[PDB]
């Protein structure tokens, strides 16, 4: 099924280490930075710039220069327990507020 | 299109049980309209499409075995209404449950 892992157990424990995740990108000259994706929980799927969070399983693609790994992780997979552990709710809410503001302003 | 994870509801006009209830009208679908309302959902008037007033998360194609709260948690686990009403341990229960549901059947 599509649905995102909101348990405290990672969906892909084989990608639980940074170094495991880093290797998946290989050479990588997409708009957004591979080290920063890896720190944000992501590993490469091996097609385009598709990445998945090792924990929540959540997938993201089509990275723009202005799109931040942690920020996009929170936008789209807010139930992620890796996210919650690494950044912690005060960060997490401010970024939700930031997003939900933009969506309720120019849009 | 991304789900609202703030403590402020995306559709405050549907914040009241009363107001959500009125959206259904005569409801022919397999899931109970009051259970849906209590769980934050209101109807679009397009088949059994509903959305949470707070997170804005949409759900459709309701089978008889699908509970509003469980589905809310499955698909929109960041919803703060959900968090306020059920607690995180309820949410975890549901997710622990669905993951393990997946795993036994294969
Ligand atoms: C960095 C940003 C991310 N944006 C969102 C995005 O990437 N999302 C949102 C959503 C979570 C709904 C989503 N779900 C899927 C399906 O699982 C996939 C595809 C996938 C990704 C990685 C994989 F390993 C395998 C499959 C992408 C995606 C991008 C904008 N989105 C691009 C896709 O279409 C929608 C549009 C809003 C811009 N860049
Ligand atoms: C009660 C259950 C719910 N299931 C999941 C479901 O309904 N989801 C999951 C997901 C969150 C990805 C999703 N995103 C959209 C797009 O917004 C919509 C469509 C929508 C709903 C209400 C609206 F106001 C407007 C649009 C449905 C939907 C149902 C199974 N899903 C049905 C849709 O296709 C996928 C399949 C897994 C079974 N019933
Ligand atoms: Na109706
Ligand atoms: Zn994640
Ligand atoms: Zn909600």
Query: B36: domain CATH number?
Result: 1.10.1170.10
Sheet of A51-53: strands edge to edge?
A42-44, A51-53, A59-60
CA distances from A76 to A18, A55, A66, B24, B37 (A): 21, 14, 16, 29, 25
CA of B51 to the centre of ligand 5 (A): 8
Question: What residues pair up with B43 in beta bridges, in sequence order?
Answer: B50
Instruction: Provide the pairing of β-strand B41-43 with B50-52.
Output: antiparallel
With a 6 Å cutoff on the Cβ, whether A43 touches ligand 1 is no
Structural domain harbouring A80: 1-107
A interface test, pick of B1, B3, B4, B5 with most A CB neighbours within 10 Å: B5
d(CA A84, CA A96): 13
Question: What residues pair up with B51 in beta bridges, in sequence order?
Answer: B42, B58
Mutate to test the pocket of ligand 2, among B20, B23, B58, B60 (most ligand atoms within 8 A of CB): B60
d(CA A29, CA A31): 7
Question: Under DSSP, is residue A86 helix (H, G, I), strand (E, B) or coil?
Answer: helix
Closest-lying ligand 1 atom to the alpha carbon of residue A47: 24
CA distances from B96 to A69, B3, B75 (A): 26, 21, 13
**How many structural domains are present in chain B?**
1
- Helix axes of A89-103 and A69-76: crossing angle, nearest 10 degrees: 80
CA distances from B48 to A6, A26, A27 (A): 26, 46, 47
Chain B CB contacts of A97 under 8 Å are 6
Instruction: Provide the pairing of β-strand B50-52 with A51-53.
Output: unpaired
């Amino acid at each position: 099924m599509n649905f995102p892992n909101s348990t405290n157990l990672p969906r892909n424990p084989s990608m639980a280490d940074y170094e495991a995740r880093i290797f998946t990108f290989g050479t990588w000259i997409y708009s957004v930075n591979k080290e920063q994706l890896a720190r944000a929980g992501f590993y490469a799927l091996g097609e385009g710039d598709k990445v998945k969070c090792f924990h929540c399983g959540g997938g993201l693609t089509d990275w723009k220069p202005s799109e931040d790994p942690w920020e996009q992780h929170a936008k789209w997979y807010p139930g992620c327990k890796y996210l919650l552990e690494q950044k912690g709710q005060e960060y997490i809410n401010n970024i939700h507020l930031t997003h939900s503001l933009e969506e309720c302003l120019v849009r």
